[PDB]
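[job 0412] stage=fold_complex status=start
inputs:
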Amino acid sequence: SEISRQEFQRRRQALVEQMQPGSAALIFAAPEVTRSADSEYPYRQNSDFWYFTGFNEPEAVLVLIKSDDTHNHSVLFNRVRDLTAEIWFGRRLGQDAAPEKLGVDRALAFSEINQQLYQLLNGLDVVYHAQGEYAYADVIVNSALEKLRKGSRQNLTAPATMIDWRPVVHEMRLFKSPEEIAVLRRAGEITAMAHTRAMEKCRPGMFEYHLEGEIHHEFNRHGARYPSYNTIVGSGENGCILHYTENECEMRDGDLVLIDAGCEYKGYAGAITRTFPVNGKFTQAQREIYDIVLESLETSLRLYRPGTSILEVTGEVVRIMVSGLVKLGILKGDVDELIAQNAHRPFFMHGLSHWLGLDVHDVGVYGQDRSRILEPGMVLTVEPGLYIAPDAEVPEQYRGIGIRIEDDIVITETGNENLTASVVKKPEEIEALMVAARKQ
Amino acid sequence: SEISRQEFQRRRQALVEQMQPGSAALIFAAPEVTRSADSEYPYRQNSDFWYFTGFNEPEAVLVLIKSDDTHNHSVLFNRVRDLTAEIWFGRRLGQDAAPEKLGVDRALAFSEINQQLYQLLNGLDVVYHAQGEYAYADVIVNSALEKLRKGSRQNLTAPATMIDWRPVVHEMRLFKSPEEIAVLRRAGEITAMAHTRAMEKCRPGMFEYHLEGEIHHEFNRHGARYPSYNTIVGSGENGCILHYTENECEMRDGDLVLIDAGCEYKGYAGAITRTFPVNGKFTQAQREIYDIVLESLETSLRLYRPGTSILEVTGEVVRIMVSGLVKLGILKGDVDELIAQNAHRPFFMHGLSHWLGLDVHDVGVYGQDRSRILEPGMVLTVEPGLYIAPDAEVPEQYRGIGIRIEDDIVITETGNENLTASVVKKPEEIEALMVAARKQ
Amino acid sequence: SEISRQEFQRRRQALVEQMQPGSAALIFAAPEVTRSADSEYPYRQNSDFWYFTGFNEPEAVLVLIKSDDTHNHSVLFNRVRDLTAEIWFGRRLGQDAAPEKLGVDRALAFSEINQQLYQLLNGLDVVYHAQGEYAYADVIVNSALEKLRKGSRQNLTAPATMIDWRPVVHEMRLFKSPEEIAVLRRAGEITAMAHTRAMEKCRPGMFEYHLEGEIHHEFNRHGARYPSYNTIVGSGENGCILHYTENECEMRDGDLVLIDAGCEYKGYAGAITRTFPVNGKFTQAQREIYDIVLESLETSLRLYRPGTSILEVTGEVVRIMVSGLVKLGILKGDVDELIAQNAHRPFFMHGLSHWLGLDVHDVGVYGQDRSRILEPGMVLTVEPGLYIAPDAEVPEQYRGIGIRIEDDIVITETGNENLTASVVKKPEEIEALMVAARKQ
Amino acid sequence: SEISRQEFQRRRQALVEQMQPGSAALIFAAPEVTRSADSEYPYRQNSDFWYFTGFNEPEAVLVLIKSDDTHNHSVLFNRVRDLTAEIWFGRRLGQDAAPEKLGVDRALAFSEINQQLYQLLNGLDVVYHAQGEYAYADVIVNSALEKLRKGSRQNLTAPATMIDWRPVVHEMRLFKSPEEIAVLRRAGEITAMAHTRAMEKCRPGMFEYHLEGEIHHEFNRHGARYPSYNTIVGSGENGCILHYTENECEMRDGDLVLIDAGCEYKGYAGAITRTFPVNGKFTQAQREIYDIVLESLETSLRLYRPGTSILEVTGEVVRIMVSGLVKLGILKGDVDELIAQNAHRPFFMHGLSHWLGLDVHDVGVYGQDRSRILEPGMVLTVEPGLYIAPDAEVPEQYRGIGIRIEDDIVITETGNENLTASVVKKPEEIEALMVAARKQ
Ligand SMILES: [Mg+2]
Ligand SMILES: [Mg+2]
Ligand SMILES: [Mg+2]
Ligand SMILES: [Mg+2]
Ligand code: NA
Ligand code: NA
Ligand code: NA
Ligand code: NA
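[job 0412] stage=fold_complex status=done
writing structure:
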């Protein structure tokens, strides 16, 4: 699926509806980013700029101006067309084509921004600006406001009020529209296909990075060129490191491998974690830990619905975890006391869920301890895990095991929809998939 | 192959040999780089820092101190070990293990650098520093020198001389050792295997990005996780854009596809360009242009040897090109006059060769117009191309054709060695490879 | 006179009354200012900080916090007491004595500001800050707001709205209270005594700087240690330069001398300009120009009252000037046409009046072309002048004459009060004063 | 006296003689300095810029270029002439008049510096620059060097070596020429006349600031418009504060007053301190302390000569002081032991002598503990003092006494010349001067 021209227009209007009359909002593009010397990384647009434009160039600024409650318009500053610069570095939109292509009322050259921006802000009461996001942007904005402040003999006046639009825009981004959900739904299918493929390709003697290669190839072939985050392939003890990205080790028969990977499809992030045996067959010790993480996931997927919270569901996961670990002799004592002492924290030291969207760790207010009441349109990860350190004082057979299982969901009117359920997570289904692949 | 501990030691000593007595050289690691919000790009070490250390962490500084012509030592500042930071973001070397692992005499915590660096620079005459490379580094160095300048009542004195070490270090990097050549030799084999695979997989109806996926998968499977630059797959008119990286178009029967891709293997860059027909069979018009570019490459490979220059060989390429284009009726006039008017420039607008090493566009002085005399150990690309614009005033059949063929070579005592010859470039060999693959 | 503790309290409350509930206002002290190497200029407090505190130290910040419409409090950050720093650089207020001495509720050490300010701003809706006034202040404020923005897991939130308090505070400063007027009244008496003394001391053969010395001595002896601006003593052609401060020339018999000087008394600026003959007797040519400037001043002093404007009175001055210059043959043509062509501008190129207070060119909105309606409590200068360049194409006898006469006034319920009338300006009174002095 | 055109030329040549061939030295003018809002302090040129030019404008840069051991030239960047800017803010030198007036070979507009400076530095080996002195200067220099570094395709190269010229220039400034000594000699006469006048004007009931006024008036009348530092008038307990500049107290019969003041004459600083009784008659307790400080001064003036050091003479002063304080019962114990314990430090906590020149605390290397061997042409202060705190545990009659007596001297071939001896310091001579004045 994709995001339509009309959707980008609706988003801008939704922002304008919330702005004060006599105001302007400034949204700046991301700068290009050096990898080494003269070579740059693949360009990644600022998520907020992208949200309002679907425009993937640097040196661009969107200005939305609200004159009053019925009148408003949009100006884009963007790179000029240039034959020499384009024969080298590829095509640019320019000013002539921008109004039509992007649905803005006016487009100006980014090279003229210091001569034009103060003219757009003159006499307004409020400017909405994300201060400290990018240094180049603060320079441009502070420079416009200084001209206006010092220009009273030329009948210029500066807006005295500056408001951060991020709280407002992040609240919009927190609730996904049907179009956004269709995109994320496809991101989830793509990400799942990559995880199925890694399970099917994994053999003892392959390196962790080989599975990374299979995953990226699968993303690419469905049109997701880049991952939404650095892929994690942690076999054995490397699975106890939460963001292990070295992916440098030989995968050994007897070990588990934890794969945490997600594609970026039309800007939107998938995020799946699967843990599975390198040799296609879980040991008893591995099943004992795996079943605790899986029950935590399956219970969470049953509970998440409008009217509950991440905090409330986390409480139920903690109970499942402490209960399971007491039965294995990994924790000792009374379950209720151990829960009150947060005795699970050495083994499960991260949150259960985070928002998901244009960023893998998405924007939006969580509330104290993630107590915010869930409502339809919210998209989140559910990612329980247990990590037993190599030197943990526990029975030998559980030391050095890291297991995480993560699904992505959207809250619906009556419950949730699982966007990532097309990759298996039940241990018998994992084993059948790997056996079937090893034949073929 | 790889670079040994002993090689990194030799490089540091070679730098120290050139330093003044009573001096210190400061080499700073690259900062981490944001992709979007809280997520970062895969870390890429500064090439000069990497050259002297093979150490792939941020927040690190190498200080080499020459007391006199027989005494010198090395201090490393680097991140401290930290259980919580490592359970999350993975393992760190720390101070205890650094002296041995990296062959430095002393290692200190990067968090103490502002309390320790001025003590290392006190009373020295010269400091070697790459000013303006990184802002965080200039802050650290200017801050140390200000303490010393203002500390005469505490018997501190600053070095009055600051020298840029980049000219010296870039002259070292320009001449590759046998170990470096073995690494680059393998980078070339890997890069060639990726290009062969793309030729074998290409079918009409695939998208440009699908070939990018095949290439990256092939890099990865030989241990080159990342490309050395953003892969270019330009089919049809997209081949006229020199650094086209959108790779967004459907590849059409009848078109050529230009693939410019290179792996990064142990820090070193491969760089190959191949142009070939999407449908596996060159048309007459396509052969006519291709043969000019190929003769330019083959002649260049014959000529490059110690004692000549990039400028001298470029002169011979220009002659081949203008001569070929006059025979096709793309240029009109006398060949010698057209050469004197630089009449090839609309069609061939970049250099023939650049240095190659830890950076794809490597460091090293070229001399005026690239007239520097070539010597053994220099590694370069040879990359002739012809690009006829869609709207060029030339016979219709040549409009919208972009063809580049690039090989990587090292200058040897008697000539050169071609590091990338294991991927085919003769048109009949390309066609046979694609036919063989289409059967299967 | 002086400004009472109670007055500073009323001003702070007047600011708080205008603030939104759930907000804080930050007012930063001026930094110390280098004259040369290690030596500094006499400290001059920021006018806005001074206005609210009467506290003459650097490294101080006033924070006014409005919790709601009935509750608010004040925190001062200021330098800690320190025996060694004080034996050297003199006494400091410290934290213990500040609440009582300055009438603030709490005082904290300036050295702890980065650890305490974000705690004061946490959870507020609005912060009032003069952005771009001082760089050290912006660093402190941006740093507090970044901690809050990134501290949601610690239950911190930043105020999303930032408002410039300068418009509000400058509107307060524009209207002087009775206490302020008593201070300015004394500043005017002191400044007048200095100008009388310069007229009485002036002899041919003295240097311009000698009169500067007499003026500064007179300021000092009444308790005004510093001038409010760099004293101007322009004799002859130097009087045509509006802010001549070289004061380097020998004063010649036959020349006029223009003295523009003003004391700073309790922070408040006097500003008087007088022009008079070096030899104590005006020539006919000098009287002809002087009488035009004097009529402009005397008429202005009659007209200024509530309900008129600087623009309206300037119109009447322009008429007097153009009329006078036509009678001398300095302008040729019809008076109404010459007025419409602004034909006075080569000879009178500055404004008639500016606001006066804690700054000589004081804060406050003038309106387009200085059209703002005057109201009681406004304090302004009235400073007509005529400057005929040495090379002006006018009758020889008027070339190189610069004449300015400036008085300071406060608008009252029925008219104005002249704060500077105790120094003579009528030519016969000037001459009598100088004759009497020469006997002384 | 004054400094000649020829002297400024000799200084520049002396710097050039020490520069490497193929180099340039950049000396930047001081920026203008805000006092309050739009008003600025009296301009004070950078001492090093002034030393080489005698040019008192901002926005100026001197570039001295040494091509080789016999060829060199000077370029000045300075403000362009501008009729409007000059009618307002006074006259400028401009480019046409600069070569002749200042003895430079070429003059360019400061507004073109970013377009011209890199052209002057292109292809040089060394640049001499005082890094971190002024931020605007570092911006200009870093910007020129970045253009050159990145301009190799345009055949530009940057100098790789940057050397701080301050050590060299400060060593030149440390040794005064005969012309400089004649200027300082007159600065000393002027400063002495001011101190004599303050002694003659002082009466009980005057404020400390009134004596400041008398002193500044006396400076001004001899052509020293500004003090070289903020005048100190500390009566009573205020004399125990080393840099007391509040000068706010009523001078009381029975108290001493310590006056520390110095004029700035042609850029050069006088610096005299005198202590004397407000009522013109020393008490016994006051004489007891005064005689110790005076013996310290008189002995120092006998000892200072080529071949000794500030450290060596300080040792003799410490002995005189500890010996005197033991006789008064202010210190108890054996003199040699008390000296070894540095028992004088509570009462005499600053150095005896500092260099004096264009800065009151002048440039030049002192050596460890000020052990540098004195040579002819060095100019220094000799300023012993004793400060007994109000709460010191000593006999009551000595509490709250601060006494400093300071003279300025130049080292000569056989001894020293006292530049400030024309103001009295013997107590009977002080008393006779004050009695004579009271009759006024
Ligand atoms: Mg195990
Ligand atoms: Mg065609
Ligand atoms: Mg005349
Ligand atoms: Mg006493
Ligand atoms: Na996640
Ligand atoms: Na290349
Ligand atoms: Na004025
Ligand atoms: Na002194």
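[job 0412] summary: Chains A and D do not touch (no CB pair under 8 Å).
[job 0412] exit 0
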